[PDB]
Write a protein that binds this ligand. Sequence first.
Ligand SMILES: *[C@@H]1O[C@H](CO)[C@@H](O[C@@H]2O[C@H](CO)[C@@H](O[C@@H]3O[C@H](CO[C@H]4O[C@H](CO)[C@@H](O)[C@H](O[C@H]5O[C@H](CO)[C@@H](O)[C@H](O)[C@@H]5O[C@H]5O[C@H](CO)[C@@H](O)[C@H](O)[C@@H]5O)[C@@H]4O)[C@@H](O)[C@H](O[C@H]4O[C@H](CO)[C@@H](O)[C@H](O)[C@@H]4O[C@H]4O[C@H](CO)[C@@H](O)[C@H](O)[C@@H]4O)[C@@H]3O)[C@H](O)[C@H]2NC(C)=O)[C@H](O)[C@H]1NC(C)=O
Ligand SMILES: O=S(=O)(C1COC1)N1Cc2cnc(N[C@@H]3Cc4ccc(Cl)cc4C3)nc2C1
Ligand SMILES: [Ca+2]
Ligand SMILES: [Ca+2]
Ligand SMILES: [K+]
Ligand code: NA
Ligand SMILES: [Zn+2]
Length: 805
Amino acid sequence: WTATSGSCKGRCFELQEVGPPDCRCDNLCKSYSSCCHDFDELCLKTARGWECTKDRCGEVRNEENACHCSEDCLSRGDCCTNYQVVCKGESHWVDDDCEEIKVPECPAGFVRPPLIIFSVDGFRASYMKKGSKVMPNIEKLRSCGTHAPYMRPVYPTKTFPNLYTLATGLYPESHGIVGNSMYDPVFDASFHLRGREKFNHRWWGGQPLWITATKQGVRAGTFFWSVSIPHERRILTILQWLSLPDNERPSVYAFYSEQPDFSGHKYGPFGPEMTNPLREIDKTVGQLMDGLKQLRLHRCVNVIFVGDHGMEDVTCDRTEFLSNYLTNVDDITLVPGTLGRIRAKSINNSKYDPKTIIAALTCKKPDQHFKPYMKQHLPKRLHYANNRRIEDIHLLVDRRWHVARKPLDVYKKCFFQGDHGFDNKVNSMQTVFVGYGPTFKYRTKVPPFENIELYNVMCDLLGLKPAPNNGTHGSLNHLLRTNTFRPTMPDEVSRPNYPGIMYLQSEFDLGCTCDDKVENKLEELNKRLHTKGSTKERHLLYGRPAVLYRTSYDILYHTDFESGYSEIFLMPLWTSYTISKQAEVSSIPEHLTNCVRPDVRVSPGFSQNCLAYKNDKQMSYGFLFPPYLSSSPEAKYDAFLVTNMVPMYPAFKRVWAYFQRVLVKKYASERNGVNVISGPIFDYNYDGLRDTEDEIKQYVEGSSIPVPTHYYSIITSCLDFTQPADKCDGPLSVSSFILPHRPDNDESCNSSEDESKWVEELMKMHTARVRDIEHLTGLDFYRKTSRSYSEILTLKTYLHTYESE
Ligand SMILES: *[C@@H]1O[C@H](CO)[C@@H](O[C@@H]2O[C@H](CO)[C@@H](O[C@@H]3O[C@H](CO[C@H]4O[C@H](CO)[C@@H](O)[C@H](O[C@H]5O[C@H](CO)[C@@H](O)[C@H](O)[C@@H]5O[C@H]5O[C@H](CO)[C@@H](O)[C@H](O)[C@@H]5O)[C@@H]4O)[C@@H](O)[C@H](O[C@H]4O[C@H](CO)[C@@H](O)[C@H](O)[C@@H]4O[C@H]4O[C@H](CO)[C@@H](O)[C@H](O)[C@@H]4O)[C@@H]3O)[C@H](O)[C@H]2NC(C)=O)[C@H](O)[C@H]1NC(C)=O
Ligand SMILES: O=S(=O)(C1COC1)N1Cc2cnc(N[C@@H]3Cc4ccc(Cl)cc4C3)nc2C1
Ligand SMILES: [Ca+2]
Ligand SMILES: [Ca+2]
Ligand SMILES: [K+]
Ligand code: NA
Ligand SMILES: [Zn+2]
């Protein structure tokens, strides 16, 4: 209930939301049907439109007009944005030459440059090039400021998850806005686009920028605008807030456009009808910049132009129906469209079985346009599992497609030609970033980056300490002229042991055999030097990884590789090796097929054993350093040490063996040598973070050998590929992956074919950032380069996407 009998007199677009039943005058009052009776009359004036004309110049102030052309308007802060152009012979901002802004040029009383976030819904990355002729204001921000070729959204590539990620720096699984539609089984409540439940604060986790600002004494504009407030009025309201007295005036503001998303759904991303929306957005940017120039704030404010996601061609005819796969379609609830989430229609149905649903949806039709996953098996780069609002069963939909439960869902609700929500590495889902202002750089291109990083930078621009988030603070320092954030590397928590030879062969009763009984002072000395780390400079190029948790581990040196061996997990945390462009691939000799050799540096009590692998009829083993890449027949014996062995399902070994035998040498050929760091990951609770020992759900039968959920590799080389990986003077190039350790290849519909037809496709889907592996292992990589730490942070956030242009 609202007493709408109150008045908005002297309250229009007030910043402090007032308490029901009192009537509101803020920019969301319409959304809550709570505005005072006179809001439209006082706060949404339209008379004489949005532009001064020569006949209005010097007019007698008429308070009814939407904006003013009277002499007093600049001091009132309510001129039409084109006032000085029409009435004082000034130029539009877009017609002025670009001039570097080295320092804020602000009016007296400004304590810091304001930040204006100009957010555009559905603004696909390629609009910056394809629409450039019709967006001159945006093209000037882009060319004169700091821009990325694109910005990667989060998954799912929907509006509410991406706008709230921009606000918080958090993954959707952590902020809790995991889609535009959600069911929370703890609240027993549903969140939708239409309706009131979404205004309840219990959905919205973490700490958004406006709260971070307000808590630290920095005043914020209200970020959210009711849809019926015209864009011109949003701009004029921002410009009026910027004219408030110093003690009252916000430092951070947001503009929001529903375009071009609204039109993109109707017409497709490049429908001819898409030209006019882009022109209108460009005109709005023009109104803001002219308005700032009028207030002498155009060389004072930092402007961010940013999108939430792109837009793909999607039509009604490209829908997959679960009714064509499931017998039982009436016993499920589907969250549909460009992703699928499945749960039981009733928690009272004891016959509901997720296993039988996954199997009925797996590789059933030759061109099937979605893939089912239990959420813990989704690519780790999506970070889409650790939330009770994310259903256990997920469908990853192909770009250009929809999934729906039954045909009648599509035509009892064709219309639309565009949609979004797909995997955040798809090119059509990429969006935009431009920064312009005294704190950004001038005429600077930066590499593509993820939208999770922007919260930190917005905090930097405002002198705020960010709330804990998923950005890597410092990784976007290269966007900024000043206010860089200069972090220290984390302290190593556990120092390694460097064991020498301490055990005789006969102390080991592991059930292992090896035909290695094959007997010289020259090469005796060499073997000893290799075990003391004489080659470590060749194989550990960036220092040893730091262990950022309390544990017991050993550094183990070898001719061809170095490892950090966990006495708790009985396997390497990491294995590091360098493969030159010239390296030779060799076989596992027949006499060594089943060879596993005790490591006389490591106690039998801290070793794996072969008898557990023989007893465990599902589990086999593989090696982290590949025997295929040994430098010599003698050095190859090192690769069969029990300390290089890890548990592997036969289905995984198909992938691992092809990687190690074919792909590592391919990458060394293409990249002029590679450095590889490989290892296990344990994430049984799918939270993206290193498991403790007490979280491990599976062991090799009869043993304390824990089974990894995933295997990673980090593959590093010289960005200047004319230099070999091991003699690189400059910046690095990295690609990484986190492969799921699964007992079947059901994820790969073509896994009956030769590994050359499906293994690389799998590894591309499971591409990772080094940062993702850091979270999952508690290791800190690249500790010893001669690069700037911020440059290394940028490298650690890089994702190799494998999308063409
Ligand atoms: C991305 O960045 C984010 C932010 O840094 C990282 O998320 C953090 O991760 C930490 C580890 O998972 C986590 O720390 C826990 O916090 C608990 C206190 O939490 C409340 O308070 C904070 C601070 O204001 C608040 O942010 C939280 O907000 C979450 O929860 C509410 C749910 O009501 C949501 O609205 C909000 O969206 C957010 O949800 C997300 O996080 C929760 C986990 O908190 C998930 O369940 C959700 O799905 C969603 O992902 C909370 O309001 C604290 O109580 C925990 O401490 C227990 O665990 C430690 C382990 O060391 C143990 O030693 C303690 O003794 C304690 O154990 C006791 O409780 C156990 C569980 O009940 C029980 O088993 C024991 O037996 C004991 O009784 C823990 O410290 C931190 O909250 C989140 N923060 C956020 C914002 O998500 C994230 O990891 C990053 N991602 C990656 C991949 O790097
Ligand atoms: O319902 S909508 O999804 C959509 C309209 O029809 C579908 N919806 C209405 C609305 C109104 N205002 C805003 N303002 C945005 C929120 C936000 C978050 C982070 C940052 Cl950095 C800036 C901003 C400004 N955003 C929205 C989104
Ligand atoms: Ca959107
Ligand atoms: Ca975990
Ligand atoms: K076995
Ligand atoms: Na398969
Ligand atoms: Zn949309």
